[PDB]
Amino acid sequence: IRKGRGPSSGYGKTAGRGTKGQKAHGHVKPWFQGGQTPLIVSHGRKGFVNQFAADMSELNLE
């Protein structure tokens, strides 16, 4: 898909970006949800990651 190479190719003028928005002029942050607070803030993070546990290599009898 080579964009910007004519109308018949299917990606000629705007290259599948739309028409004069923030997503056409610049870039939108990935973590941005329009301003609404994310769930990890309204709920918070749960638990901790155990950094001292041993990573055993399991082996079964079968």
Partner 1 sequence: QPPISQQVKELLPVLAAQPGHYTTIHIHGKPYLVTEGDTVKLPFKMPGVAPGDVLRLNRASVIGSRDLTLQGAPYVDERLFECRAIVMGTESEPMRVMIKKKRRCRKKKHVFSKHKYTVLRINQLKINDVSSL
Partner RNA sequence: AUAAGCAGCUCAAGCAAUAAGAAAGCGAGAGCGUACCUUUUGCAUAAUGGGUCACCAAGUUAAUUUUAGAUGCGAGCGAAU
Partner RNA sequence: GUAUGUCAAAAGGGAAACAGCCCAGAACAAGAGUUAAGGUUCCAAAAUUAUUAUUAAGUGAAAUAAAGAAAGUUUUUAUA
Partner RNA sequence: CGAAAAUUUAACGGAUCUAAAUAAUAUACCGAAACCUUGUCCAUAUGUAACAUUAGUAAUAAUAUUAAUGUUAUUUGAUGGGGUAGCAGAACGUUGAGUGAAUCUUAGAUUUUUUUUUUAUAACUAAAUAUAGAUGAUAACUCAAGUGAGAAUGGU
Contact flags string 3-42 toward Mg ion, x per CB under 5 A: -------------x-x--x---------------------
- In this structure, what are the phi and psi dihedrals at residue 32, rounded to the nearest 5 degrees? -80, 130
Are 8 and 14 within 8 A, CB to CB?
Answer: no
Cα 13–Cα 16–Cα 19 angle in degrees, nearest 5: 70
Residues 23-42 that bind partner 1 (CB under 8 A): none
Residues 3-32 that bind RNA (CB under 7 A): 3-7, 9-20, 24
Binding site for K ion (CB under 5 A): 20
